[PDB]
Subunit: 303 residues, 4 copies
């Protein structure tokens, strides 16, 4: 293994070209992105056999300073004329390999830094502000891209993946976990109605990488839309386990977006422990946080 | 100083009585709380001279186990019939002092654990789910209450405070910071148009503590409404500093809620450093995260 | 309330004047600080009635920028000729009030950023390579005011140790507490008590905190080692009982101190396996999040 | 991909069999582990084609509950008769596949929860009181599969040290790098290089990782001390240059290792004061968030 790069390259751009012309789905009102504020956290990794002596001999002759990669990323966000994190990564990668001929491979991660709208009164009415936004520490979109230079100096994308990270969903009822193995290691009680609490990271891959860029936006799959599928399927489903849930979410995603090849899930169980099962004159209950150990599932659904 | 207690007492209740009948303000659509899910993180501190020997002699005869205070809090959330964190704290405090006659003072903090609604399709339409909610790691409401037992065994509230914590607001333009002291310690440039980024914790105190409980909900001041005042004033104001901003927010709060005695602000500056000032054929710019040191302000506005 | 300032002012100084000549105590090997690397995280807060219009009118005429406060602190760490965080805070405080006549009060916190020695090869401690520690760290607090007669006065000073996490595998009990409708906790005659400790002390004479007479300076390193020694020596009956005895020992070792203040938290593990064949050992695991805490002052 | 499991399975064992008889090296005083307190955080992941319907149909017939996996790991720490995290992982892996015939693969991570000795009073290290450390910690990884012939086989094993944060105040340069339209970084012939290191190693013979023959076990404590020694000895020309030399030294000291893998990060401070009167010292501060990193393998 041999690579190096720069992490936590935060870059905030105002007034990126808006994302419009997207194709809608029943589960989501998503219709585009205003891009008044477009925030991204970028990680860049680069490799190539010509970097060996930077490690083995301390020769920096062919070392692009990681500080310079930070400058490269932030300057290119200024000159980017597209509309997606996916397309920004392609722009950075192609530009970087064109600039640095001795680099053979580049890998990029971009993580959205999301901002939400806020209310303001003006000119007689209250409406969403075009100026004041709220930084969100909840779920966020992600993008990943790897690009290589071939022997003939052409550049090729070798992997692309989009995603939604940090989605934390609790469904208060309509979930069971029963019928699992009950042996000498089992102390979990069967539960016909638990408040299942899942953390979800959902990643998708396109059949055709061009559809990830937003250039023909009707072919773009938006993380907002993926979020809303996940919440809708969770609501619709009398869940039998997280495993059961995530497969159903993945099936719906691939049905809604035939241009996707597959969807991958990383789920975690964070379901609360129950403290009060019955409350006089109410269907309510009381729960609290569990001990630290958390279940998890990793699963791919393909077309 | 002598007290002890329990922190991070998470308690989640389903189907608390809804909060309705509130009085509206121009800055906010807030009209109440459904309370399908009501989550609170409680810290309890207790004191009293009769606790001395628990420290000086290792005598636990009069020690309420902190583990038992956790049970006390979680059981009382089950039996609570009111509609606010403020009222829940009063219920816990009065109940605890009534139960433990040797305790002379109790202090409680309650922090909302907020959940947001999500979309689901069902019966032909898409609408907010009554079952699936999204845990939010953004701003949250807070409540504080201190209660004492008097020599005659009556109980009195000695301090009450409500709040909104963790509000992170960025306004992309319409903010200046110019005219500050420029001496041998000054390297900050004057800036006539910066993207001011503030973290805000806003705390308010009522003229009459009863108005905090929600029993007559038209007198309750909701953290949601305070949030929307803050965003509206930020939008409306050509800010001259954070100091200038927070005073204006506080004035609006006290004008909208004459039943409040004062409002207190803890603000932090997290404004990004500018990297690209000019972008061809665009009003946009590029910024990035600053170094760690952060400015802050603490200020009270009173009626 | 009306004040403003700057937090997370990190400053790292190499080769500060070493702290030498400190009085040692039985419990600790501490005898000074080499100060090859001196790291401190400073927070400054300033007040004054003349700041009012910076809020009420947006007038920045009398605003020292918080960014400039950061420069002030960093430049003063370069010119500081002393040997303690406590003394550095006094230097900053006096310099700032002398510079800015419209400021009536200044509050400072300094938190050590600790670095530990490492081995380099015969093996010996390196004088160049250090290990950044995320464990316990020393702290200092100072509040200084301008009086009506233009004299400057320290109104409060406090040193401390923060982030000390100690677990004693045996020799701790918690029994005899109240058992009623809300008590589910079992009594335990031998628990592996795990405590987090923040310990703070005040001097009888604020000058002793500066280190100018090193014999009268109380080092957070020595407080740490007192706490571990007393924990080891004591068959604890509760955290309350433990911290009282720690405080008593500190005050006995440092008669120049007026008080010791404790903030403790209980993080004891849940026991899962009570008996292991042919062993005295047990298996424990992490508890649920709720944590007990205590706050207590011992006075000289 | 199809697997599931349990993370953050904390388990603390008192009085595990001590690790004795380890081979020492010049760079480290390490010679064994008392194991009065043995803390490990385990993550388990399991796979098998027969799990498919637990996803596609909601059939829990063949689901070992992740909660039960937690019980499995904790109970096996109580019955473990060995002396290393690496060996404990092998014990868990083999036991789990032997128990559950429908599981075809198991992956385990174990992360040490480290505790340091403290002083108790003559002053001496306590045998009861320990300090929880949030600094560097040892790690272990193991993957085991069931073959078509029902034999069990370890397909991957890796030990490591994580979270090592080292700063060398002088004796480091970074010069000669590419200078073009994107380069603003100044060359530096004497910088206080601050690196975070995660170091991982693989054995030629997976059995050497278990500790059964302690002479062949490579301790994370010894890797730590090699890293600090090499850092001290080397006039570094970059982090790339440093980690190569660290790797070479590790492989020279432990011929039983096949490779050493590094993940490093640059956290060097920005310099604010270049010269202080009558001192060799300087003042630095924390940089902006973006951090450089390197990843490199050295092979025997
Ligand atoms: O949904 C779940 N899947 C599982 O595998 C599991 N194990 N414990 N709880 C669980 N819940
Ligand atoms: O709004 C601000 N107030 C201040 O006091 C300040 N100081 N630096 N930047 C600042 N911004
Ligand atoms: O030392 C303790 N003091 C306490 O008050 C307490 N309460 N639960 N456990 C406890 N342990
Ligand atoms: O050691 C370093 N290697 C690098 O590649 C680099 N880039 N910026 N600074 C650096 N330091």
């Amino acid at each position: 293994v041999m690579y190096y790069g720069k992490g936590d390259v935060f870059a905030y751009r105002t007034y990126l070209k808006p994302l419009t012309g997207v194709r809608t789905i029943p589960e989501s009102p998503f219709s585009g992105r205003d891009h008044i504020l477009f925030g991204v956290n970028v990680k860049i990794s680069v490799g190539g056999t010509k970097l060996l002596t930077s490690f083995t001999k301390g020769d920096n002759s062919l070392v692009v300073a990681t500080d310079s990669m930070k400058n490269f990323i932030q300057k290119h966000l200024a000159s980017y004329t597209g509309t997606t994190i996916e397309g920004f990564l392609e722009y950075v990668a192609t530009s970087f390999l064109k600039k640095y001929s001795h680099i053979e491979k580049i890998s990029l991660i971009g993580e959205e830094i999301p901002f939400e709208t806020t209310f303001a009164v003006k000119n007689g009415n209250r409406a969403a502000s075009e100026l004041v936004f709220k930084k969100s520490r909840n779920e966020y979109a992600t993008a990943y891209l790897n690009m290589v230079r071939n022997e003939d100096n052409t550049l090729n994308i070798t992997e692309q993946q989009s995603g939604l990270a940090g989605l934390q969903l609790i469904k208060v009822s309509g979930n069971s976990f029963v019928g699992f193995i009950r042996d000498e290691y089992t102390t979990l009680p069967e539960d016909s109605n638990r408040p299942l609490f899942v953390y979800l990271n959902i990643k998708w891959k396109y059949k055709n990488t061009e559809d990830s860029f937003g250039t023909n936006p009707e072919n773009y799959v938006a993380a907002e839309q993926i979020r809303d599928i996940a919440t809708s399927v969770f609501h619709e489903t009398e869940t039998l386990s997280i495993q059961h849930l995530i497969y159903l979410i993945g099936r719906r995603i691939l049905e809604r977006f035939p241009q996707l090849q597959e969807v991958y899930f990383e789920s975690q169980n964070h379901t609360w422990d129950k403290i009060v099962e019955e409350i006089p004159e109410s269907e309510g209950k009381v729960y609290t946080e569990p001990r630290p150990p958390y279940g998890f599932q990793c699963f791919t659904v393909t077309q």
